[model samples]
Target: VNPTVFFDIAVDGEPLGRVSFELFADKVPKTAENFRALSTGEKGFGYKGSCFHRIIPGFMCQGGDFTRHNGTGGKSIYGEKFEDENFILKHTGPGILTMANAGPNTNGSQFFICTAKTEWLDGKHVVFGKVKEGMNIVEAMERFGSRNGKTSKKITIADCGQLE
Candidate 1:
């Protein structure tokens, strides 16, 4: 299924424009559902003022933290085991999206888009979506220099309803 989610970012109270992502449900059903829940406020998991804490220029950008004001928080560390052996999606190049996990199935809504092909991460991470557009916006966003930096960027899901 082709699902799209709209996100608006705000830095220091400055409202950034909207950016949309096209999610691939067929590829990663559980991860896609988790993202959908957060976007629609169903799970109330999205915490504003979060940043892409870790960014590897041409590799990937990690975010989706809710505990701290930045991307330092993550979901509870209790879930299924990593199903890499069962997963079929492959991480190619830019626009490819996948879940960020501490260990196996310990994914808590955090995800990243591949700025370049990252075959090493294949089977290790779950690919859920791809950036159909707004990739430049994601790239333009200020990067968090360190693992513990004050890169606070608020993301709000304007409306995560059905596609028109």
Candidate 2:
């Protein structure tokens, strides 16, 4: 069975809600494991204090860049990055979880949860999971987002970890 993880989110220092996700381990083990370990803080660092640095109202919310706490810096457990794994999964719709990268084979700690159908990203980004619950929090997050990709209010992952 696939593992599940969660992020207790906050907005501008106020509690937002919990967002849970089921990792696609059977389809993308490496990518899924990276997200799992990172959420559990198995490494020295993870996404616990990170903020969603980029948000698009009808697109996606991106975060997990704990190092820089922004979209600019984040690395994978397999050194700075690991391979893309494969394009077996697709960004078919909202609530899809996928890795965010600078280019091919550059996926690291950064990830995004889609808020809209993003089929155009197919074969480019690695779709490794999907939101299992608390999608409303994602929808609520859109209120702080803008076309410029910056959030009007700070969106943060106040706490996070794996579940079972």
Candidate 3:
């Protein structure tokens, strides 16, 4: 898990198709470890069938809740939460993957994908991954996303693993 991590997301009953990504584990090792652990079920339960419960238009779509299947669920591999990786990277633009949290040091299993440039959140979240492909599908997900930030259909993670 020290290289690129692949994420395949299956949109529930939508023509948007699967969402694909290449996460950089090398840049942010600790946060990448957490994401890799939860994504592969190496910790407990992975984000297999979880939905991106939070969707902010022109912002990000957040998911990876493995506990309660909703927003208030999920922590990291270590569990009960920990400090932010807040790595050397930043949320520069679209397809950017980052850790979603309540505040500083509140990082957990919840992660998000930036659909647009959000530089203001530079030091707020940890950018650990990027969408290598399927930005259109992510856009479709955003388009179909509700104001409450719930997916019209369940945004399930079909598969997630280290690519190289």
Candidate 4:
């Protein structure tokens, strides 16, 4: 069975809602485990206080840079970076969870949730999960997004963990 995780979000310090994700463990175990561990904070370094640093209105909302809280920093449970497990999944539509890397095989802790069909990212990024619930919160986030991948209001992952 797939594992489920959740993020209690906050917009400019106000509680928004929870966004839950179902990880594709059967298809991408390594990639899904990386996300699962980070969400549970077993390593003491996870996505708790990290803000969604990049939010493109018609694209994706990117975050997971816990160290810097921006697009410039984050590290994987394995190390600072890890190799792509496989690109078996595709970014065919919205609410898709995917890794964000600088280039090929450079995946770190950073990831994004697609708000729109991101077919262009297929075969490049590892799609390991999908929104299981609370997508309305994500769609609401788009109201504060800009074309340049910035947000008018700060969107933060207030709390996160594996869901029971």
Question: Please, what are the lDDT tens digits per residue for candidate 1 over residues 1-164?
Answer: 56787666544456655557777776666677666656655455453445555665656666666555344456632233234323578888888878877777567757776777888888888888887667876665535323443344533333343341
Q: Can you give the TM-score per candidate against the true fold?
A: 0.76, 0.98, 0.86, 0.98
lDDT of 4 by residue, 70-135 (tens): 788999999989999999999989899999999989999999899999998889999999999999
Clashes of each: 1, 0, 0, 0
Q: What lDDT score goes with residue 23 in model 2?
A: 97
Q: Flag clash pairs in model 4.
A: none
lDDT of each: 0.61, 0.92, 0.76, 0.92
Q: Once superposed on the true structure, which residue ranges of model 2 sit more than 4 Å away at CA? A: none
Error of 3 at 93 (Å): 0.6
Residue runs of model 4 more than 4 Å from their true location after superposition:
none
**lDDT by residue (tens digit), candidate 3, 121-164:** 88888888888777887887787577667666767667776555
After TM-score superposition, what is the CA distance of residue 86 in candidate 3 from its true location, in Å? 2.9
lDDT of 2 by residue, 1-164 (tens): 99999999899999999999999999999999999999999988888889998999889999989999877898888899999999999898999999998889999999989998899889999999999999998899878999989889999989999886
**Alpha-carbon error at 16 in model 1, in Å?**
2.9
Candidate 1 clashes between residue pairs 3 or more apart in a chain or in different chains: 49-154
> C-alpha displacement of 55 in model 4, angstroms?
0.3
